[PDB]
């Protein structure tokens, strides 16, 4: 999640028209939300364990 | 029984004063930069319990 | 502040005063600004006059 | 009218950092300046022709 | 109204804004120079 | 005309943001006393515990043929267990009450911040509407791209407040639900202690 957040924060500085809704943008938002899902399922098993 | 009650009517004070302190030392702090500064709603407005000195 | 501790203290009567004072001061500077941007307008109108005449 | 629109746009730039918004007012306040300016330009060139 | 696009696009603020308050919706679409004092 | 619409709207959002936070003051005040009713039950349940402990300490003080296991020893032990189970139930509800009060104030301070920003803007946009051509004050502020640099679209703007108001009332309904829970937990533990003492 540490890479996926910094990857998008650097790409928010693309000048003018370069700041695009390419599929890399939506996938990294999907990547960020999946690790949050994964870190929430894994902390669930620790509380069970 | 009476002495026990005095303890539970003297502790209320201690607890009260201990809290008052926090909402009084924290105030002294709040200095401009203070990231929580704000124009509150009805700031100058005596509440209910308002006692005296 | 809880129960009785909520007491009108030297601070309340004092802070509540500072508020009124700060709001009056803020008013003074606002009116002063208006009495200065007014002057700048005059300065400009007179410049236009002096320049047109030049 | 040109004076007013710059003062209107300047004060709105001092709106709070999340309250600073792209309201339609800002949209017109910009377009307004453009027209006022290009109109003074048309008026300035006609003074040259006069 | 219409959120159009100008050729110089300046999205700087939105960034700092959502930085102090995450909860924020997209600032997407739907005077070309700075003052020297700025 | 357009700036005016913004004010009307901004005022519609501001006046409504003023009702939410003053109401959150009132509900926290009702929870403020209900936490105190919670504690003063813990204040008055230590006396019965000292009564039961004294009664057990003096009833061991009996002579040889009458030192007996009877119904009084059963109900005196059950009262001692019931008092201890009341106090631990009352200590846990206090720790839930202070957390509800903290979340009431946190959700409240947030709503008030938005109102502070709104107040500043209101005053600014209000002045901007009273700018007449025949008025001085206005100047030739050199053009700058920062005059168009915005940080929220009108829609997103509302959403910010809308969200604040949603979660704020979530703390409202919650405290109401907890104040019902506090009222029910007092009527039960008081009546169980009276039925045991009888």
Swiss-Prot record, chain A:
N- and O-glycosylated. May be proteolytically processed during the epididymal transit of spermatozoa. It comes from the Eukaryota. It is found in: Cytoplasm, Cytoskeleton, Cilium axoneme; Cytoplasm, Cytoskeleton, Flagellum axoneme; Cytoplasmic vesicle, Secretory vesicle, Acrosome outer membrane. Expressed in spermatozoa where it localizes to the sperm head (at protein level). Detected at lower levels in the sperm flagellum (at protein level). Expressed in trachea multiciliated cells. Microtubule inner protein (MIP) part of the dynein-decorated doublet microtubules (DMTs) in cilia and flagellar axoneme. Forms filamentous polymers in the walls of ciliary and flagellar microtubules. Required for normal sperm mobility. Belongs to the tektin family. Microtubule inner protein component of sperm flagellar doublet microtubules. Interacts with TEKT1, TEKT2, TEKT4 and TEKT5. Interacts with CCDC38. This is Tektin-3. It comes from Bos taurus. The lineage of its organism: Eukaryota, Metazoa, Chordata, Craniata, Vertebrata. The gene is TEKT3. The chain holds residues 393 to 441 of 490 of the full protein.
From Swiss-Prot, chain C:
Tyrosine phosphorylated. Ubiquitinated, leading to its degradation. Deubiquitinated by USP16, promoting its stability. This is Tektin-2. Expressed in trachea multiciliated cells. The chain holds residues 324 to 377 of 430 of the full protein. Microtubule inner protein (MIP) part of the dynein-decorated doublet microtubules (DMTs) in cilia and flagellar axoneme. Plays a key role in the assembly or attachment of the inner dynein arm to microtubules in sperm flagella and tracheal cilia. Forms filamentous polymers in the walls of ciliary and flagellar microtubules. Microtubule inner protein component of sperm flagellar doublet microtubules. May interact with CCDC172. Belongs to the tektin family. It is found in: Cytoplasm, Cytoskeleton, Cilium axoneme; Cytoplasm, Cytoskeleton, Flagellum axoneme; Cytoplasm, Cytoskeleton, Microtubule organizing center. It comes from the Eukaryota.
Curated annotation (Swiss-Prot), chain D:
It is found in: Cytoplasm, Cytoskeleton, Cilium axoneme; Cytoplasm, Cytoskeleton, Flagellum axoneme. Expressed in trachea multiciliated cells. Ubiquitinated, leading to its degradation. Deubiquitinated by USP16, promoting its stability. Belongs to the tektin family. Microtubule inner protein (MIP) part of the dynein-decorated doublet microtubules (DMTs) in cilia and flagellar axoneme. Forms filamentous polymers in the walls of ciliary and flagellar microtubules. Contributes to normal sperm motility. Microtubule inner protein component of sperm flagellar doublet microtubules. This is Tektin-4. It comes from Bos taurus. The lineage of its organism: Eukaryota, Metazoa, Chordata, Craniata, Vertebrata. The chain holds residues 349 to 398 of 447 of the full protein.
